[PDB]
């Protein structure tokens, strides 16, 4: 419910949080399954809007 | 000033909203991809259309 309440601006800055956190590989690897569960649910839920966003910055961020 | 139409795609539960006021996640009909979290007063369900006066204000909780 916490992940569904937030709008798409907060989905975009959540993706910015994930993109910031998988450079610091001490707290990527100490929170891998939590990060995986939350990110996969977030883009699975906002997947209709996420793929219709058109910006190369978000495309490179996802990549 | 125009008005816009928005089809509900999720009835947001487990928000701590004021009674009688349910938060909701609507999408628009003119571009069928962008969404906004509103909060309605009536008895609302999924995929019913509601008429937003302005499209540029996400909703908070009420309490």
């Amino acid at each position: 419910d916490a992940l569904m309440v937030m709008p798409f601006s907060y989905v975009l800055k959540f993706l910015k949080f994930i993109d910031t956190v998988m450079q610091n590989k001490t707290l990527l690897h100490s929170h891998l399954p939590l990060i995986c569960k939350n990110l996969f649910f977030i883009i699975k839920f906002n997947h209709k809007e996420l793929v219709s966003q058109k910006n190369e910055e978000l495309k490179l961020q996802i990549n | 000033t125009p008005v816009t139409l928005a089809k509900v795609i999720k009835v947001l539960g487990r928000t701590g909203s004021r009674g009688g006021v349910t938060q909701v996640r609507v999408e628009f009909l003119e571009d069928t991809s962008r969404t906004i979290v509103r909060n309605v007063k009536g008895p609302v369900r999924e995929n019913d259309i509601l008429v937003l006066m302005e499209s540029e204000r996400e909703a908070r909780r009420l309490r």
């Binding site: 419910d1 992940l3 937030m6 | 928000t15």
Partner: peptide, 11 residues
């Protein structure tokens, strides 16, 4: 007090 979801949003 807030709850989860909006604590995550403000953080």
């Amino acid at each position: 007090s807030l709850k989860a979801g909006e604590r995550l949003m403000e953080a």
